[PDB]
Amino acid sequence: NTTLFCASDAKAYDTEVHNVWATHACVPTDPSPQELKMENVTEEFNMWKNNMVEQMHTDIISLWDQSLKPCVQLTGGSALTQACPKVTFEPIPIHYCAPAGYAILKCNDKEFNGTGLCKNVSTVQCTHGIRPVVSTQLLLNGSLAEGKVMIRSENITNNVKNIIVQLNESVTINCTRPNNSGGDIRQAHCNVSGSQWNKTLHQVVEQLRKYWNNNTIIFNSSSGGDLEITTHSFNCGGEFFYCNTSGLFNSNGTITLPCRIKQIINMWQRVGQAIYAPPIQGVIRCVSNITGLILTRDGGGNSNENETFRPGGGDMRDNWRSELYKYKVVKIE
């Protein structure tokens, strides 16, 4: 393999953690126009072994480390300290492009499980827009399935491996922290249409079957672990939100999820703990498109008319893999 560039239509003046870094590490691009398609061509793909994923993982780590400075970091009994000014934080689109001597193949088969032969191949010079969204359980601001929902795993029969779902219909989520009013400045809530959401599962579940015969599926909350993977976590405006999804995973109104702002977090960049400064004042509010989930399946028990699925995640490579699956780098020969 080889190292790639990237691309970002990010402003030079707008001082925001993503933009300022994007301005000093990318290019606007690109050579028009489209993906030159191939016909009657067959090519092998493998989403789970794709060097572009590893390269992306390293870049986003560098961004956060240079952008969101924790005041204190603890790893292996060692303490690191630095300035931790509050910053503005918000996702930016990103494309990855190939250098002189390589090209990026793109699989266009609508129903693709990530492995095997692709019959509608093409060749772009750079990828689609990727939002470097760091989160657990729920994938936000991603790309939608072309037709109906699609699921992918390294081995569905193996319970240790995560199942990646790709929705075909976005579910908008509004999280807000009111100006508090004798109130807890860390108390926030998330609202989503109950009616809208009670139809997305009705389509995922149908496809979760079929693989597991006519077993009945039940969703339960996380079995336990760090608070960060038991709850739906994400970064909003530099602030860290943690949302209880029990009502979301209990098998025609509104779902209201309770939230907490935390200053102490276990790092995704490295095994350890980090502390950020207290939350800013005023309203903190973010609207995002839910486009996917990460699931793990309860094993052990036999076909007791249930397999049971619980929210997972943690390895942010899975977040990157969910978007980068349909690409591969090749050498011209």
């Binding site: 336990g224 276990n266 790092m267 095994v271 490579r317």
Partner: peptide, 27 residues
Amino acid sequence: XNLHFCQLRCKSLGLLGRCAXTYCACV
């Protein structure tokens, strides 16, 4: 991830521990 302490924590819930990236997950 710290797998040992992850394991040390999960069995107290009746569960085995394993890494989920840099995080502890109970099985």
